[PDB]
Symmetry: C2
Subunit: 256 residues, 2 copies
């Protein structure tokens, strides 16, 4: 359908306001939708990875400075690569913890909204699983209840996957980290390239990336394309683009 993404939810001075042009594109989708949203700290490769789910080299804009780039929530509606009569809806979002914004409540509001619209929720962190990232995920989850399948991605991962002398998979690392989201999954990613090639990463063909990184991305994408389910609402109703439009309006209005 769409050749580029567009802003679904604007955030100019921290006001969550829907964008009509994107809303109108949503309601013209009568197919069931798979909604994959991405959330994590800012400057963390989120936009760059989501473009991989689209199969295109560019899409959500990625930038290379210390300053945040993505604002609000962005949407890309494309045919599901495996699944006939299904549309893949990608939600790319403004990273949390931007020091120039310094507005945790706006952060929490963007988080909650991406978590409410998604059927697959991609939580993007760097190096390792941090307790603060778990606590934030938990707290937004509790707020989201009072008003999806978890894919925890670990970027620039090099620590030994080793707990008390035993080699573990990322999935077992994630499981070990959450002991005292029914469907959970955890994907690791190497440093995509050497550090001085990182700013131009978008323009680099697979040839010039870390070979393992390329396979880890294909692994991440294949899992999504073949396990991420149609967005579902209580009462065995299946969400199409029109119903997702209503949820966007419902949730935006309830948050503000």
């Amino acid at each position: 359908h769409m050749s580029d993404p567009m802003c679904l939810i604007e955030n100019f001075n921290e006001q969550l306001k829907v964008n009509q042009e994107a809303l109108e594109i949503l309601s013209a989708i009568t197919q069931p939708v798979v909604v994959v949203a991405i959330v994590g700290l800012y400057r963390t490769g989120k936009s760059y990875l989501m473009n991989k789910l689209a199969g295109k080299n560019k899409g959500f804009s990625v930038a290379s400075t210390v300053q945040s780039h993505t604002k609000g929530i962005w949407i890309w509606c494309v045919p599901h690569p495996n699944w006939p009569n299904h549309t893949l809806v990608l939600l790319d979002t403004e990273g949390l913890g931007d020091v120039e914004k310094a507005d945790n409540k706006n952060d929490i509001q963007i988080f909650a909204l991406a978590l409410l619209l998604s059927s697959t929720f991609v939580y993007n962190t760097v190096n390792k699983i941090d307790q603060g990232a778990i606590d934030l995920l938990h707290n937004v989850t509790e707020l989201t209840d009072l008003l999806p399948d978890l894919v925890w991605t670990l970027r620039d991962f090099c620590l030994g996957l080793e707990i008390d002398g035993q080699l573990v998979t990322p999935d077992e690392y994630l499981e070990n980290s959450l002991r005292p989201f029914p469907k959970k999954k955890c994907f690791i990613f190497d440093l995509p390239a050497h550090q001085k090639k990182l700013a131009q990463l978008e323009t680099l063909p697979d040839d010039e990336l870390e070979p393992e990184f390329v396979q880890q991305v294909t692994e991440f994408c294949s899992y999504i394309f073949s396990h991420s389910m149609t967005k579902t609402l209580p009462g065995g109703i299946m969400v199409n683009g029109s119903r997702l439009k209503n949820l966007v309006l419902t949730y935006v209005n309830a948050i503000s």
Copy 2:
């Protein structure tokens, strides 16, 4: 000659180690106390050994699990300031997912802060708002428990230092990030090894490390050696080893 544990943390019970207290009380020279704090698995222990001018000291280790526990102390001669002892504090990193005791983290944070005359705050990739909020929270809390130079170290730094179209020094990046610790400084460090051969980093010589990283560590160390001052109590009272020991006892109680 080798660091020893100052504050033990078995079962998240903070307790003083009498052997380290007794070494401190025999130091009559003024002390320059440098403490490092950051999230776990962030190369704190590795960096602190650079200040000691010894390739080995504080133990590092390379798996997803936390390694350093409690607070370790290492009293070494100041490299260029006669009759001054450089007291290095290496701390258990924050946010360890196996710990399930957020209160214990904050107490280690407060203790390191209360004892330091130079406080090194070690973060990865970027300054993020959660790290500032945590610094502010703990700084506010230590002023109650009392009823210091800040050096922000940015590890694995690749983002462009450019804000609103203008190049920034690390100092300016810190200042822009903190804009709504009287003395403040900031330092960037490249990825040290241009191969994620990071797990054996402690064994490599400088010629196999990233050269920019070697030069960045030297500048960090030079600043600590030239700018860090003797720990000072209110009233211009200058802290020697014997006085620092009683500081440790006072604050361990105030934190309990």
